[PDB]
Amino acid sequence: MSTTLFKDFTFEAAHRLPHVPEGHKCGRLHGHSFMVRLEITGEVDPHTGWIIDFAELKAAFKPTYERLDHHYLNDIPGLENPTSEVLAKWIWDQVKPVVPLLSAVMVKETCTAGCIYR
Amino acid sequence: MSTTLFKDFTFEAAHRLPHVPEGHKCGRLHGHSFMVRLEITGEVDPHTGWIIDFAELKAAFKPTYERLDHHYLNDIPGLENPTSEVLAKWIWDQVKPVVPLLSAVMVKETCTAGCIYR
Amino acid sequence: TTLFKDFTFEAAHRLPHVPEGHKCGRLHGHSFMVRLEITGEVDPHTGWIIDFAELKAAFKPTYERLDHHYLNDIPGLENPTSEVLAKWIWDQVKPVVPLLSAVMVKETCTAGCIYRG
Amino acid sequence: TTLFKDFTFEAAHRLPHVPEGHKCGRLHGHSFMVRLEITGEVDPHTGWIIDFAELKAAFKPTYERLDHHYLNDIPGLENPTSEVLAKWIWDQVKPVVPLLSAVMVKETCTAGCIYRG
Amino acid sequence: MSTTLFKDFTFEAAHRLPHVPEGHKCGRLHGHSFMVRLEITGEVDPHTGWIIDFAELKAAFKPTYERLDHHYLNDIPGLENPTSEVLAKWIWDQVKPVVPLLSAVMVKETCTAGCIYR
Amino acid sequence: TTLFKDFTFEAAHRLPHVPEGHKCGRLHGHSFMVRLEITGEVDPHTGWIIDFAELKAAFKPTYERLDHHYLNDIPGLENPTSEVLAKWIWDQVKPVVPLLSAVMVKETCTAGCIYRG
Ligand SMILES: [Zn+2]
Ligand SMILES: [Zn+2]
Ligand SMILES: [Zn+2]
Ligand SMILES: [Zn+2]
Ligand SMILES: [Zn+2]
Ligand SMILES: [Zn+2]
């Protein structure tokens, strides 16, 4: 049987949805306190007792983090439609290359509402 | 690989357990601040960038919601034994017909205790 | 210096004096949070105003009266609003916990009430 | 006796008067929490200081002005810090809710601000 | 399709990591407010409407609980390297024998960081 | 107007002056929450009482003394109750943050302590 590990970051940005019908609240400029969850799966080095470091995880994420934190998302190439579904994937795509063990990504824009890409 | 989405509602009702041994706290009339989590899986329309709406999800749930919120659960046909296990299913059963993408239902009666039916 | 301790208990209530078919008038329930908070000086030796276990015991009677119960049944709780209810709690505990200074009650996660003094 | 009600709304803002390329000066956003809290006596009959639904309605105008909006656009919110912002809210509501006694605003989960009186 | 159930406990202990490079914050004596989640899967007795009791679950866990709560973890045989990965497993191992339905164990040492063994 | 900022740090402690084999006397630990809160007037131009980053820096020394450490080792923290501990923190920070008005410490999620003034 298997072990997975998981780490939460939060960040602050503004976004808007380009393709919502004209009235929709969601297409007005607005913002959120997003939460992101990286999750990794793999083996547990018998010496460190770790799937992986974390210092190493943080710093691998960080440049991707910094691009979103306290920023407007539609200006980031890839996120012209900054939906949770689109964003969760956008992350997977940036970090999967530098974190091979990336198992799944989760994005919550509100307390009460989220998204999990694999 | 695949994307799932998820939405939290909370509601207020009273319930009691019909079949607990005579002393049990749980068979006295009492109530809870329940939390319910609908989760859907499916594809991400390339134009909307959405698995589905939400306004559309909310309103599809709503009649089922309204029947539980600020109500006593044993009076609802189906919930004569308003356990989490029984309730989580009871929901699946009402909403799966109107939300084909329903992937799983979660019911938490306390902060610290829940149930996930699929 | 003030301390404060928090408890959830799980119960039912309806409000009797509410309009027509208003939804708080239908027998419902909530997961409630109660916060006793107390003010005194720390013992220069224990480093404590009270245990937190001295507290627990002194509450426990009132606590099991409410947890997993229906509130309207409880003399003094005909009409169990947050306001009635926090006050009622204060009346029960102030005798057994003289240092006690506030009682806070929350029905839901987002509403709540403080009965000070 | 005090009551308090809590609301999240979801919005964008940037701070105009901040150094160089400081990160709060880049157009960002937050999930905000607002807490109105009010002080009065309970009706000896309703058991209430106010509904919580009387409240909701009296706020609702100001609330939809902020939710899902950009704040700098809102006259009086050029410079939307927590401090500016809680005060601004107080100025809008104190007229419509005279019992109102504090306004608390939180940008993030861990920072926040109370504008009393 | 299937029902799983889940229960949260929290506990207080101190631990340190034996095998971190010399500076690391993590190898200094420190402690945490850990959270543990037992999760069970099985069938729902049609009379009780329960996968299982809980009173029965609690008390089956309890001796294992008591050994960790308000204790230093490196002194417990098995936990000489009290990492989340190692600890989550350590639990599985103690409770799986007395709770056959144990489906998965979760350990969170901070609000923002955890581990799920199966 | 008051602001408040929140920090978790992760540490160990035991209480020396506690009965027999009482469980707080066994070397344990907690995830602690510290809340500095401060009261002053907002700058009519910045819209701020303080940064939140001016704060962070002024705390940081005391903060890394506690985070990931054992508390009984720290002069003045023989006997690290919440009460001792919040006060101790106040004594360290009030010099570096004169506007500071409360310090709140929480051992667990449900207990806690405020050292005002
Ligand atoms: Zn949005
Ligand atoms: Zn129940
Ligand atoms: Zn109610
Ligand atoms: Zn900001
Ligand atoms: Zn640690
Ligand atoms: Zn302790």
Side-chain angles (χ1 to χ4, degrees):
Chain A
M1 281 299 348
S2 130
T3 319
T4 110
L5 217 38
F6 78 90
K7 178 52 155 150
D8 287 359
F9 317 78
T10 81
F11 75 71
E12 318 294 323
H15 76 149
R16 56 153 188 117
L17 305 188
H19 315 134
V20 288
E22 218 185 359
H24 210 79
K25 281 161 173 137
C26 258
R28 258 143 53 191
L29 187 85
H30 69 270
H32 308 284
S33 293
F34 300 76
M35 183 261 133
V36 68
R37 160 161 306 166
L38 311 194
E39 150 178 321
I40 34 273
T41 301
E43 299 213 322
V44 243
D45 170 328
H47 179 75
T48 49
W50 270 349
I51 302 183
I52 56 131
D53 200 343
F54 260 133
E56 176 196 281
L57 170 53
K58 280 202 176 202
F61 189 29
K62 207 210 191 175
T64 296
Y65 177 82
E66 286 184 38
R67 281 176 83 179
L68 321 143
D69 175 76
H70 276 89
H71 271 292
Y72 171 40
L73 298 173
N74 313 56
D75 281 352
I76 287 164
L79 291 166
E80 349 290 342
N81 194 173
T83 225
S84 281
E85 304 90 324
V86 174
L87 163 52
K89 176 104 179 303
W90 184 95
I91 289 167
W92 173 280
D93 281 5
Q94 309 303 325
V95 15
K96 188 55 190 206
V98 301
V99 173
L101 298 177
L102 194 68
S103 167
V105 190
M106 198 190 70
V107 174
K108 262 160 91 148
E109 39 156 68
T110 104
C111 258
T112 53
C115 189
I116 326 165
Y117 181 89
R118 307 161 178 293
Chain B
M1 281 299 348
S2 130
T3 319
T4 110
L5 217 38
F6 78 90
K7 178 52 155 150
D8 287 359
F9 317 78
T10 81
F11 75 71
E12 318 294 323
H15 76 149
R16 56 153 188 117
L17 305 188
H19 315 134
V20 288
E22 218 185 359
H24 210 79
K25 281 161 173 137
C26 258
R28 258 143 53 191
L29 187 85
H30 69 270
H32 308 284
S33 293
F34 300 76
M35 183 261 133
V36 68
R37 160 161 306 166
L38 311 194
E39 150 178 321
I40 34 273
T41 301
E43 299 213 322
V44 243
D45 170 328
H47 179 75
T48 49
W50 270 349
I51 302 183
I52 56 131
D53 200 343
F54 260 133
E56 176 196 281
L57 170 53
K58 280 202 176 202
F61 189 29
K62 207 210 191 175
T64 296
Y65 177 82
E66 286 184 38
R67 281 176 83 179
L68 321 143
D69 175 76
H70 276 89
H71 271 292
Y72 171 40
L73 298 173
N74 313 56
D75 281 352
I76 287 164
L79 291 166
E80 349 290 342
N81 194 173
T83 225
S84 281
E85 304 90 324
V86 174
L87 163 52
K89 176 104 179 303
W90 184 95
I91 289 167
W92 173 280
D93 281 5
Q94 309 303 325
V95 15
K96 188 55 190 206
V98 301
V99 173
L101 298 177
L102 194 68
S103 167
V105 190
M106 198 190 70
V107 174
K108 262 160 91 148
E109 39 156 68
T110 104
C111 258
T112 53
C115 189
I116 326 165
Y117 181 89
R118 307 161 178 293
Chain C
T1 328
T2 327
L3 297 165
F4 69 89
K5 172 80 218 217
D6 283 6
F7 329 78
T8 336
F9 62 91
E10 310 291 346
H13 79 157
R14 57 132 64 90
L15 295 103
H17 307 272
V18 123
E20 264 294 36
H22 177 266
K23 73 196 224 286
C24 271
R26 278 142 51 202
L27 160 93
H28 60 279
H30 318 256
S31 292
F32 288 68
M33 203 244 69
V34 201
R35 144 113 99 259
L36 318 182
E37 103 169 23
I38 72 168
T39 351
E41 40 274 68
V42 327
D43 173 22
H45 187 81
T46 43
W48 271 345
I49 306 170
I50 201 209
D51 298 42
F52 269 146
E54 275 278 11
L55 192 33
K56 190 165 302 292
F59 196 24
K60 192 172 132 158
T62 306
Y63 174 94
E64 61 213 19
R65 277 187 84 184
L66 324 128
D67 175 55
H68 285 256
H69 278 282
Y70 172 46
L71 296 192
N72 306 220
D73 283 358
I74 298 180
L77 291 194
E78 318 72 14
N79 209 10
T81 53
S82 291
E83 303 87 299
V84 162
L85 169 32
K87 157 97 131 70
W88 178 90
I89 290 168
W90 164 289
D91 296 316
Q92 318 307 325
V93 207
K94 187 61 165 185
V96 269
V97 192
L99 277 177
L100 165 83
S101 56
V103 155
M104 189 203 54
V105 173
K106 285 170 96 168
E107 313 243 308
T108 60
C109 230
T110 82
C113 166
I114 343 275
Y115 183 71
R116 188 79 58 16
Chain D
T1 328
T2 327
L3 297 165
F4 69 89
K5 172 80 218 217
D6 283 6
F7 329 78
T8 336
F9 62 91
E10 310 291 346
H13 79 157
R14 57 132 64 90
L15 295 103
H17 307 273
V18 123
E20 264 294 36
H22 177 266
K23 73 197 224 286
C24 271
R26 278 142 51 202
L27 160 93
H28 60 279
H30 318 256
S31 292
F32 288 68
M33 203 244 69
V34 201
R35 144 113 99 259
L36 318 182
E37 103 169 23
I38 72 168
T39 351
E41 40 274 68
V42 327
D43 173 22
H45 187 81
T46 43
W48 271 345
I49 306 170
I50 201 209
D51 298 42
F52 269 146
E54 275 278 11
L55 192 33
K56 190 165 302 292
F59 196 24
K60 192 172 132 158
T62 306
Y63 174 94
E64 61 213 19
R65 277 187 84 184
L66 324 128
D67 175 55
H68 285 256
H69 278 282
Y70 172 46
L71 296 192
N72 306 220
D73 283 358
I74 298 180
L77 291 194
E78 318 72 14
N79 209 10
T81 53
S82 291
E83 304 87 299
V84 162
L85 169 32
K87 157 97 131 70
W88 178 90
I89 290 168
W90 164 289
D91 296 316
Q92 318 307 325
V93 207
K94 187 61 165 185
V96 269
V97 192
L99 277 177
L100 165 83
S101 56
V103 155
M104 189 203 54
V105 173
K106 285 170 96 168
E107 313 243 308
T108 60
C109 230
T110 82
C113 166
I114 343 275
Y115 183 71
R116 188 79 58 16
Chain E
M1 281 299 348
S2 130
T3 319
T4 110
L5 217 38
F6 78 90
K7 178 52 155 150
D8 287 359
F9 317 78
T10 81
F11 75 71
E12 318 294 323
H15 76 149
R16 56 153 188 117
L17 305 188
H19 315 134
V20 288
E22 218 185 359
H24 210 79
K25 281 161 173 137
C26 258
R28 258 143 53 191
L29 187 85
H30 69 270
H32 308 284
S33 293
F34 300 76
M35 183 261 133
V36 68
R37 160 161 306 166
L38 311 194
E39 150 178 321
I40 34 273
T41 301
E43 299 213 322
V44 243
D45 170 328
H47 179 75
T48 49
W50 270 349
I51 302 183
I52 56 131
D53 200 343
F54 260 133
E56 176 196 281
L57 170 53
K58 280 202 176 202
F61 189 29
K62 207 210 191 175
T64 296
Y65 177 82
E66 286 184 38
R67 281 176 83 179
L68 321 143
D69 175 76
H70 276 89
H71 271 292
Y72 171 40
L73 298 173
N74 313 56
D75 281 352
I76 287 164
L79 291 166
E80 349 290 342
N81 194 173
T83 225
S84 281
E85 304 90 324
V86 174
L87 163 52
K89 176 104 179 303
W90 184 95
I91 289 167
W92 173 280
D93 281 5
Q94 309 303 325
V95 15
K96 188 55 190 206
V98 301
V99 173
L101 298 177
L102 194 68
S103 167
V105 190
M106 198 190 70
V107 174
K108 262 160 91 148
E109 39 156 68
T110 104
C111 258
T112 53
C115 189
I116 326 165
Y117 181 89
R118 307 161 178 293
Chain F
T1 328
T2 327
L3 297 165
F4 69 89
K5 172 80 218 217
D6 283 6
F7 329 78
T8 336
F9 62 91
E10 310 291 346
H13 79 157
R14 57 132 64 90
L15 295 103
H17 307 272
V18 123
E20 264 294 36
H22 177 266
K23 73 196 224 286
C24 271
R26 278 142 51 202
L27 160 93
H28 60 279
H30 318 256
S31 292
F32 288 68
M33 203 244 69
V34 201
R35 144 113 99 259
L36 318 182
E37 103 169 23
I38 72 168
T39 351
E41 40 274 68
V42 327
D43 173 22
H45 187 81
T46 43
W48 271 345
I49 306 170
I50 201 209
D51 298 42
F52 269 146
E54 275 278 11
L55 192 33
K56 190 165 302 292
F59 196 24
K60 192 172 132 158
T62 306
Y63 174 94
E64 61 213 19
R65 277 187 84 184
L66 324 128
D67 175 55
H68 285 256
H69 278 282
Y70 172 46
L71 296 192
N72 306 220
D73 283 358
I74 298 180
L77 291 194
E78 318 72 14
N79 209 10
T81 53
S82 291
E83 303 87 299
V84 162
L85 169 32
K87 157 97 131 70
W88 178 90
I89 290 168
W90 164 289
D91 296 316
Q92 318 307 325
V93 207
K94 187 61 165 185
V96 269
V97 192
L99 277 177
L100 165 83
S101 56
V103 155
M104 189 203 54
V105 173
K106 285 170 96 168
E107 313 243 308
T108 60
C109 230
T110 82
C113 166
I114 343 275
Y115 183 71
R116 188 79 58 16

